[PDB]
Design a binder for this molecule. Structure first.
Ligand code: HEM
Lengths: 498, 498, 498, 499
């Protein structure tokens, strides 16, 4: 009797008021009997000329595409972003042009490590990907529910993902892998501390915040630029699940977040987020006491306050999930003029990985998929062909550039902003950037002892199943942040170890 | 110039009287400079943040799809099929519903053995596929320029195709392979004789006939059935290129068939074909002097004369060749009600092979591409998902059948025609059915002494390159068709063997 | 300190005393630093010439392949099959040739509806696939832990699967879908009663049986044929979990089946199964009160007793799960001489489905994958090419049959059995084919009073969520099996709809 | 009395010295009783699904084809070795150059450029000359051409140039407007177009042509010192070309002339060889070079940069299966062992991405598991896993994350990349107006005699004539800037054609 459990009945109401459609093959031929197969006699074998069977059976056999290598389990919704404040002094992006402008958006939430059948309510970072359909093209802000990440170099991302997933022989989640990587890489202390905090299991997707995480770049109409951070905080309030609640729910309803989001929109409780930016000038980036492009660190609110910008509103549920959610593609490199990448190593690597994996998971022409289409921008270029090529393939337009025959032209208004760099082209070590200073501020200044104990309990509940030498180096890293942090964990580890 | 050479100039005189479009990325983001790459300094290395380069380059790297395993080289056009005579007593198909009914058609000609770079004017059968967009879905008549073929059992087709293409080690056309298989399978004599006659290299595609080759089955409104052939003869006249003419044109213009057909439609010289059918009753099927479903045999006109039905007209050149011709897919299994298959073993195998290879060459959802979409029918079934799902995926419609929720329903007016078959289920040998009779009639009656000489010499020019024991068995088959036939070729071979 | 948790340390104890391997790219180039990405200066952007990063990131972007459309969540193991008795009177199959002959096997257990991330201890059928690498090629016996199935016609299979999986709009398991199809298809009664009994949730894969379910056909050396059923019963004893235990484990260890099997093998507690068959002669097939090819029916033991055959033993864990378990493919069409298919419409449908779905999920040459390779037979034929062709591609052997150059030859002894059938070619309706007779026997004779209580409880526990009109027609089906059956369920349903 | 290619099926059979035929099996190894007749219900009845033999063979026939190479689709392949003759360890520490007399297996694919899988070999086109070294430090792919230069000097123009070299997107026909509108708007193409439309446009097979790395590369020695090098391999068979008349004839008579020619030469023992040289430019001379030494449209003059010998390439083994060993072979310019790196050549930078990207598309994500692409002389050990058509053991139970405490593969600092300092703005620097004419004039006036200049002009005219007049005018102005005689001679011919 919930809106999700009645969707077939609601879809019906319209069909009772018509007749049914005629059942057809894929080629549109009417089917006379699709409940019984063609055989010679009632007890005879099946015949090849039963095309109706093979046509439907062969499409069933190809229903599955590869799930996302990460963030495989998720839920999608649609709505709009509305400007509420003028930040045209920082970014000339059309999406910020004037107060009151609405831009259609697509959103997909997710976990990270679990695959397409896992539970929603498990401890994991929560993906929060937003796709803005602007006139200067699509702007993908592929954020998640934390301002930081576990690593600061993108070449370590496949290893970290491997360590979070299944053992390659046993196919089991391996704590030895999980904490051997985290202990050997102490830059994860910051996001690990956030991961095992209360915010590690949000109460559905509507009660959590979202962050672009990376430092980005904004460019105004004068060609001047600043660096920035994208925040969108829930208007529904920060709400989490205790580990007792999510465990029950992980079995009771592994699709808790999907059901919650669909039911909420289906009854008009349209969720919303307030969209902010932090701004840091180039001079301020030269005097920041850390690397401003270090994904393990936040811009403190005192020195870089939140400037409000707008509002994210989700008011439409997907009609077909596979078409509109499973096949949606977010590319962090989808950035319209007035918004550019920073030299954040992690973001730099993301600029390659997403279109690369999307050409594998979906296909070379994945931007032709309806939800991925920049349907508010006029696409015209010199790319042609590819498997599953749709529309007119830009027809008979000349396919080489430059040309003398009227094909599209570049326009200097969309050219990037120039930055001077100097240095050797090599691999600079960032393993020993500051790993504990901002974490100590998190352990002492952000949490109460009620949250400190739950956090130390949350880590010890899972680290206990790793090897003792791993716990040694793990605790060693927590004591460098706070001796309270380590010894608190160490006592609880002494408990499970007996 | 000819309308083919001027196609870029004409596009300029239709579009380029306005401003030029905006050159964008795949995601629609405008591009300021698509002529120079992003580097650090004028002589510095390339940067990953030049995603404009990666967007265009990665799509270029993915343009190519597998060519057709056969008939890789061809040309496409579009037009209509119009009804001129009433054959509704034979077939209830909506395509012949009333005289004057027009149906949009898609057509693609082709050679057979050559790949995408081969020449048009070479000795080879000529594919002639026609796609009818009917209200009952698409009907694909995937014919060629001969009423017969080389074999009568589909299990030998992959080897015959292998024998006609490149040697697996040298990648060269091997005459040993061609005539070893042909001498070992004398059922090929009928189509080998047609291949080496003047028709083997028709003057383009407008000057050849088209045939469904196979015996088909027609069903009227009262359930009664008849067996039929599909003929469509050229209205522009039969015309053939000579050996020196085609050899020269293979050098001067490999794409002769493309250019000729394109320019004809472009100068309003629309080619056309007169549609016919032969009808054979089920009682006549039992009295037929051969297997009536034997693809190596014709139905003689004296005993089974042609019957007018309609006309085929091609009057629209493709706008983008890749999207409309290279991506087009014809399935002989695509038959609307009133048109069914016969027990032709060859056709029986083709029922599986085409939708099977199309899921590979194009993809599981290849019917979603525009030219293969049945855009005059209403596709409604319980198939969902698949790679590159292009439509709404039928929304939130119930995906299972039967169901109590108004989803599509089978209609019993589309049921197939039921007939009894007699015998054990078993591999029946057709290798030594009649191989020579209808070939002797082709040699003595269909040709004159001018055409026999030119045909015998055409065979000798290719058979001479195989080994002697291959020439021997080949002559043994030709001598078995007619003594003058075999001795004629043996005379030429002796000359070449010197 | 179970062997699963200590897999990495055990692997390192085999290192120990070996210097670790040099870390390379895909092309074998040694890597200097795989922990830091190339940039222009310590805080400059990323460079395309960091091929090491791209080489690794691009492969991580492609790790995932489509999961199985059904039976996605599974566990694999290896061992052997040993012949214990003499059934050469029935089957000339070399896999049964002598008592004591050992044939290697590979096995995969699985759930059905859950996808890759789902839990093991849920109510579902349990796939039990066995691949026999025989000297006559591979024999795939793709069974599950029940001798019957929900349907008896393969064209209903996509819809049954669709109704068991997620709603197309909400992406949630939909009880209306599950029971609308089940209520409208009473042929599901027999397997539904099994599914919701105690046997619906086995305590791991070692404590369940396996059945081929379908009728098969055995042929001996003298051409005599008989029909057959396959049975292999667990020597570890049938053991099932309560829904309370199963629901609890689905939160603790969703991989309960994988862990129990991996650790049982690794501690030498090899599970085993006793392989049986039931034999029905063709004369008994026509006298049989039921249709001996209806997948919803069993063969009663009193009239067709279990004939012992051999032993299945699993004594080796997989080394790489993805390479050995995820990529393994079973085709019921893989059958050596002495083992044939029956006119069982369901099996007839499966003959096409598995190779079809493996060419998509895995690739056209998925038989080249080692676990799918028939490494005890010599593959030699005229198939060539295909994407990712890995072996010698059969070198430079003549690729056409027949030929005169000593290529592989057919041998007539491997010919199939020839039956004569009778009747039209048409779709015969099998919806009302005795849907209750063997179900009432299951309720009355097989079960005690407790089992009936749990059965009706497990039924009403899930049917409670279907619409009232869906419950009525469902209770109608159960009451047709037995008035006590459907009234006990109805008595429970009213306590749920209150 | 027939070339070895013709007799290959006969030679295959007689290799079976009275062996007895292999048993015909399905894909899964099941013996086939009758692969000549399909299963029917009666002699005149319809086909049955339980004929698994027919479907198994047919469905694999339906999937034989893979996408062709987006460029260089038409070509031939051969295998052999590279032998070191001189000591260049002063310049590079590559194991393939380790000591004099050291041999390394090589695989080579020759190719044309524009035509697809069915085109003719003896047509005017650049010739691909890719060489794969299976060294103990992994594979070294040297993906070269038969010319030391190219048409453009920025990788972003390569798709547009290739498009303008292939078929018109509506008519599927070759288009002179497309071809000569791009070249005339991009006058950096002058240098390589002149080489194209000279006598070296249609070589007489693959054995009678040179090979070059074209790009400037970098060589690093054992001390960490680097230079800028050019790779050269010269035919030991002599420069030999086909006339326009004979090339036209052979394109019809024998479309696969080069494939056949190379195969018979190896099969009769006439193994072709190429002497491997290197040009060497220090970093000081790099700052003094009158052009951009990383400009792919320019060569280092031999008088100023002489050839230093290294060894010879030798092709002595034909492929056994063309599809598996030639059609499926994959060369990646980014396959470079230590002691060999890339220069900031913008064209080389784009190719670092394109080939492994296009190879994951054409062949599949795990294309390095294909044998002819396998670096079978080095032990692959990394933290990559799974993927479509995972072939070997997938590295077993080895830990799949780095760093790790369980003895999995480790980086070694001896393979670390050479470091160069760069300075400037990060932006798009224009190189369209670099020197486009200086070396083009040297080739027109000195490398060619009067007889070759006429054939050169007649080849440009015989093709450019089919373009529109306004394209001919801007094209001649480009040739005029090379030399007035150059532009005037072409204009003299074009006026004859256009009448
Ligand atoms: C018309 C009926 C059926 C059809 C069309 C069908 C189809 C399929 C398909 C497409 C797969 C995926 C295979 C893969 O991707 O690896 C599969 C898996 C499987 N099926 Fe069915 N199925 C049917 C009924 C059955 C029956 C009757 C049984 C057993 C008696 C069964 C047992 C299994 C098992 C065990 C697997 C998993 C194989 C593995 O572990 O890799 N199925 N089926």
């Amino acid at each position: 009797r919930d809106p999700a459990s009645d969707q077939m009945q609601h879809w019906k109401e319209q069909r009772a008021a018509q007749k049914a459609d005629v059942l057809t093959t894929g080629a549109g031929n009417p089917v006379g009997d699709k409940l019984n197969v063609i055989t010679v006699g009632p007890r005879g074998p099946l015949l090849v000329q039963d095309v109706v069977f093979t046509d439907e059976m062969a499409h069933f056999d190809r229903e599955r595409i590869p799930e996302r290598v990460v963030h495989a389990k998720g839920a999608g919704a649609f709505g709009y972003f509305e400007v509420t404040h003028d930040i045209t002094k920082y970014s000339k992006a059309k999406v910020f042009e004037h107060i009151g402008k609405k831009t259609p958006i697509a959103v997909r939430f997710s976990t990270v490590a679990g695959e397409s059948g896992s539970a929603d309510t498990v401890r994991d970072p929560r993906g929060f990907a937003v796709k803005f359909y602007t006139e200067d093209g699509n702007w993908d802000l592929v954020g998640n529910n934390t301002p930081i990440f576990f690593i600061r170099d993108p070449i370590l991302f496949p290893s970290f993902i491997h360590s979070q997933k299944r053992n390659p022989q046993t196919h089991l989640k391996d704590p030895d892998m999980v904490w051997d990587f985290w202990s050997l890489r102490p830059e994860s202390l910051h996001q690990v501390s956030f991961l095992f905090s209360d915010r590690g299991i949000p109460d559905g997707h509507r009660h959590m915040n979202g962050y672009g995480s990376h430092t980005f770049k904004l460019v105004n109409a004068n060609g001047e630029a600043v660096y920035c951070k994208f925040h969108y905080k829930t208007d529904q309030g920060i709400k989490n699940l205790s580990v007792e609640d999510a465990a029950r729910l992980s079995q009771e309803d592994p699709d808790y977040g999907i059901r919650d989001l669909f039911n909420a929109i289906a009854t008009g409780k349209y969720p919303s987020w307030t969209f902010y930016i932090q701004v840091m000038t180039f001079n301020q980036a030269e005097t920041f006491p850390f690397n401003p492009f270090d994904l393990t660190k936040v811009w403190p609110h005192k020195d870089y306050p939140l400037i409000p910008v707008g509002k994210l509103v989700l008011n439409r549920n997907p009609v077909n999930y596979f078409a509109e959610v499973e096949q949606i593609a977010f590319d962090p490199s989808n950035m319209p003029p007035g918004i550019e990448a920073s030299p954040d190593k992690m973001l730099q690597g993301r600029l390659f990985a997403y279109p690369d994996t999307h050409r594998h998971r979906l296909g070379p022409n994945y931007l032709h998929i309806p939800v991925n289409c920049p349907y508010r921008a006029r696409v015209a270029n010199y790319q042609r062909d590819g498997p599953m090529c749709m529309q007119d393939n830009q027809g008979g337009a000349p396919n080489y550039y430059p040309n003398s025959f009227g094909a599209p032209e570049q326009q200097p208004s969309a050219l990037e902003h120039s930055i001077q760099y100097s240095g050797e082209v090599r691999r600079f070590n960032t393993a020993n950037d500051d790993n504990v200073t901002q974490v100590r501020a998190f352990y002492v200044n952000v949490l109460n002892e009620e949250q400190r104990k739950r956090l130390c309990e949350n880590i010890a509940g899972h680290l206990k199943d790793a090897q003792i030498f791993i716990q040694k180096k793990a605790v060693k890293n927590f004591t460098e942040v706070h001796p309270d942090y380590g010894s608190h964990i160490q006592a609880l580890l002494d408990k499970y170890n007996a």
